[PDB]
Design a protein around this ligand. Structure first.
Ligand SMILES: Nc1ncnc2c1ncn2[C@@H]1O[C@H](COP(=O)(O)OP(=O)(O)OC[C@H]2O[C@@H](O)[C@H](O)[C@@H]2O)[C@@H](O)[C@H]1O
Length: 265
């Protein structure tokens, strides 16, 4: 865990994982024995469902394995549908009221989610043209996981986030604006959540971020430009909310989450 204090983030300690004992080197979504409640961010898709491949595929696999371990019938198709319907409705309310943490008690009708939230810092398809970025970009959700689907059966791994990153082929104008909107949403949701009663009890105290839009949403875009877009976004979000939480950046071979912020440094 490479810890570096960043002056442009107002003297905040940011973590940067190196490679791991994997063929891919990816950081694990959640730790086996964490000291903090770490909410990992799902690199979501336009369909707003949990599944598919990449990092979105990991979340599904992890949730389902833990579900089957606790002898809860949960298939990939059920998780995809149940998560899409929820995040579809929460998106509707979030867009009705930008900059406000909407909510539904998913626990009443869910084997997976105890409680689900959403937050939209900027209405999709206003500041940018979604024809360039894809739809529902910037949207962000926060789910509290029921104990039976909680990674490694650990009470602290009971929070996740889900966001949709801009497609790389978007204009630098549209891309950077979508990326900051995306980051404001993540930090905003956690900020606003920690102010809720559930936040007092189960406060998020760190955020595990992948390099958003650096996988299948990269297209023809260069990883440097993404490191910039990410660096600028974090600066604004930190300046916006002045958050107490700790940012953690997962590992990918190019290490551009760090290089970009070093440029911002
Ligand atoms: N299993 C994985 N675990 C951890 N990190 C991963 C994994 N696979 C890729 N990554 C890395 O996480 C970041 C995001 O990965 P992706 O989700 O593949 O890229 P993204 O453009 O954000 O998402 C595109 C597509 O992939 C699905 O996750 C999702 O359904 C979306 O449609 C990238 O930096 C990538 O290196």
């Amino acid at each position: 865990p490479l810890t570096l204090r960043f002056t442009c983030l107002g003297d905040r300690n940011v973590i940067f994982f190196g490679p791991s004992g994997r063929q891919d080197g990816f950081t694990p979504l959640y730790d086996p024995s964490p000291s903090k409640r770490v909410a990992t961010v799902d690199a979501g898709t336009y369909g707003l469902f949990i599944g598919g491949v990449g990092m979105n595929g990991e979340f599904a696999d992890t949730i389902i394995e833990e579900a089957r371990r606790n002898r809860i019938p949960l298939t990939a198709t059920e998780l995809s549908a149940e998560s899409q319907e929820i995040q579809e409705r929460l998106l509707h309310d979030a867009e009705r009221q930008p900059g406000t943490l909407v909510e539904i008690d998913s626990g009443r009708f869910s084997r997976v989610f105890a409680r689900s939230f959403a937050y939209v810092a900027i209405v999709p398809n206003t500041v940018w043209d979604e024809s360039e970025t894809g739809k529902n970009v910037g949207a962000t959700f926060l789910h509290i996981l029921k104990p039976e689907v909680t990674p490694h059966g650990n009470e602290m791994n009971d929070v996740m986030l889900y966001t949709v990153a801009p497609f790389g082929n978007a204009s630098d104008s549209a891309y950077n604006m979508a990326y900051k909107a995306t980051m404001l949403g993540i930090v905003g949701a956690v900020s606003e959540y920690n102010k809720t009663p559930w936040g007092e009890v189960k406060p998020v105290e760190a955020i595990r971020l992948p390099l958003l839009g650096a996988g299948h949403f990269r297209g023809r875009r260069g990883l440097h430009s993404i490191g910039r877009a990410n660096a600028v976004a974090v600066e604004a979000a930190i300046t916006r909310f002045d958050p107490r939480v700790e940012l953690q950046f997962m590992y990918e071979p190019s290490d551009t989450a760090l290089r970009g912020l070093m440029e911002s440094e």
